[PDB]
Design a protein around this ligand. Structure first.
Ligand code: NA
Lengths: 201, 167, 200, 201, 200, 200
């Protein structure tokens, strides 16, 4: 299933303990807690505001799937604590949505929130998540290698097709691999050469 | 056409355009969109030649005569902070946007080669001749985007070459 | 997987006021960057990135990475850090403390004054660079001799040989990838040689 | 009918009026006049010297045709006053050629002349026309690209032959092609590869 | 901060009697000036500056200046010198040894006898004056025309041509090796051009 | 101040009988001189110096000199040696072991036999001597002529030839690897020429 490093979920005060804030910290995970949403427009005719809720941005180190994260926070708070967990694809925009200031929330006239009420937890630094510095690129590259080995990918088109089909399972996009393999084309040639010989074995 | 321009004169009316600039002890002018240099040079003169800039960094330092052309015949190195900067101009700004559009344009060139199975640089060039504008692309600007990425290019064309023979 | 050089980040908000002195207690050589409080940020609304420190950490023997995780969280406070990465080029990471790497400087980023670097326990940058290059040079020479002995025709055969016998020669897949990066032209020569030699 | 702004042509004292300098200034266009070329050895047999002549560096105000200027000077200076009106591609080499100090002129050990005999008209300043070497290498390259495409040049010998025959039309010599493509051989390989396959179509 | 050519001063007053031999011990080639005992001294007073030597020192591979200073300090004493300076033009520094560089002559400095230069460990200046950019491209262009003229398909054919007719064009095998190093991509294009041209 | 190459004296009078074996205990490579039993002494009337050995000691990493002295004091006795000297040219000291160094020959010191050198812990002099770039450039030019002379079609054929005849031309596998590193494009041109030349 879909595997990513960045996830999000919602919390409602009525159905989680008062101490929820610190129990979130027990996990040792970077998290951004949005300002409480008590002024959101309700789709229910006859109602003014949606139930007050928090948005939570959740960062694992090793890429993990969606159910994993749903499972531990459900265990952490109670089984009546949550429903589903979203996989976040542009965390920079989801961070902005916490204040309804993302390019789509400001676009649909959603209630804006105060960015000072954002509480960051466990050294949440948004900038390290949108940049993917050298150490991350090396791990991503080694992944691409194992993919070319496993599925005997003979050229970059075969690789591209495979990423289109199964990219998210390993946290990969085409524009991502372009960045990762940039300046490594000679290495890329050796792998494709090897794959090529392996497929006439 | 380009976004970075230079010209030379022998203060407030320049701000009237509300367009980023950097005036030396030579004047450097940044358009808001890619625009033709003849156009720009009609506009200043009615206000009060012009050469399109292909690299900003070197001309920023030429406002001091301090880059490789300068070190080649070093003379009369000019002041640093004595520069009039209007309409929020800074150098970090524009070089990092240069980078991002480079990779931008590179990625779309990749998708083109995949989509239409372009086997070599001639087939790519031809496609630019006919359909270039729909993707914001010209021959000279694809040349500048793929310079320094020819090994990447060869990888792509090898792919297309062998996929074409699957059929 | 065991390595010698490591790094991690520290933020002022998450560490006690005596973190520098508590760090030197552990008796390991370390390089600490100047506070990066003027790192220009990509997020369009926070001007500068979170002010932080980079710490260069070198164990004496090749050691586990989570080991390093364990000790610093213990000594500084568990809200202090989360992950320890492992350095492959100390040359650039040492300069990166100051945004004086060629690669980061090529992407600009703010420069800091290297006098604001604090070294702990006689951190000798020249010694770890020189031992890195001659250790990696030998790993390469080892890879060469394996390609000769077993006439390995391409990089897939080499990878397979590593999986089967990597531990015997102190070699992992990810470790050969670092050794042969920037030597692919040499690799091509070796595989070409093996290929023709296997057609004899 | 090719239109450009920079021109050069010959002037013959024999066939121009005494006040010719003052007459040229009236056109109000910047001009550089070479020292009188009276010691150029001539390839015509038996005469040993070329007819004494001046080279004129001509900068029009806006793009204009070559015959346009021919007419302007014929009606100004005389019926046989000038010859070989020519469009200039690099103004700096022509200014150096005025004293036979183009590297291409000294490479043939053409007679060198005194730069102090250069006459400037309407405040011609050479620095106003010099181009940075980086960008000239870029446009010269784009030119070479265009030739390889147009004439389907499959390899560097075919390109060298084309330069031998038609180089001047594009302001190109063998050695300058060598400078331009230095450090771009990977690009060159891509072009010749393209031309090669295209000629098997 | 690494270079190969260095220079520094030595004064007989503050160096051992067998200093010349101790210098040779280091195994690096070096050129030693004639004793500078007659330099007009800008203090006036004593007319001449205290007698001193200039040493031109060539490291085997690039090193720091402090490398060299430390080495001479260990070999000769802490008192023997204060700084080793980095030389950018070996030829001028060699001519300065006798006050015959253009700038020594421009200041009317006392000239010394070139035979009093002491050479150590096969120091030969002609070995370090190399690779003029202007000349390396002209030789290159010559190599190009030879590959065109005689349709030389590969580097063996070129080398054979040099062996037989090199003298005509001022070319030797090793000098071509210098000229084409770092232009091998260009070389390939040329040989491909020749190769296809010989199948016409 | 820390160095890798050291030397010191040992006097039989002041050292244990099993001193040679005790030196092997350290796991450091060492070169021991033939006993200098016939060195002419500047003492009026004594003829010869006290019989002594010179020991060339190769420290594992950069180390301080006093560290090495103390460690020899613990191993052999506190009276075993007095000071440890830093070696600056490892080759020159090794020749000094037999007074076959240029400074020994210049001072006419008694020559000793090279077979009486005792090597310890796989001491090989050729692993410590360093070559200059002019010497590395000629080694490359040498590899070129070998590829020409014996029409070596690939790098395996080249290595095989080095295995068989490397010493004749001052070449080892690993020293070939250093010499051709960063010249793999030139290498491919050479092998192509040899390849096409063998199909002729
Ligand atoms: Na604490």
């Amino acid at each position: 299933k879909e595997k990513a490093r960045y996830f999000t979920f919602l919390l409602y005060p009525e159905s989680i303990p008062s101490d929820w804030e610190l129990k979130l910290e027990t996990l040792g995970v970077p998290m951004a807690i949005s300002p409480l949403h008590d002024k959101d427009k309700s789709s229910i005719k006859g109602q003014k505001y949606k139930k007050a809720h928090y948005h939570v941005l959740y960062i694992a180190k090793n890429p993990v799937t969606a159910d994993s994260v749903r499972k531990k926070i459900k265990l952490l708070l109670g089984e009546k604590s949550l429903a589903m967990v979203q996989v976040v694809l542009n965390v920079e925009n989801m961070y902005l949505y916490l204040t309804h200031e993302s390019k789509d929330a400001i676009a649909k006239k959603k209630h804006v929130y105060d960015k000072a009420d954002i509480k960051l937890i466990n050294n949440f630094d948004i900038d390290r998540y949108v940049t993917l510095d050298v150490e991350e690129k090396t791990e991503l590259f080694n992944v691409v290698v194992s993919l070319i080995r496993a599925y005997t990918l003979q050229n970059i088109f075969d690789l591209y097709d495979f990423i289109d089909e199964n990219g998210e399972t390993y946290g990969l996009t085409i524009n991502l691999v372009n960045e990762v393999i940039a300046g490594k084309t000679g290495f890329m040639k050796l792998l494709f050469d090897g794959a090529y010989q392996r497929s006439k074995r």
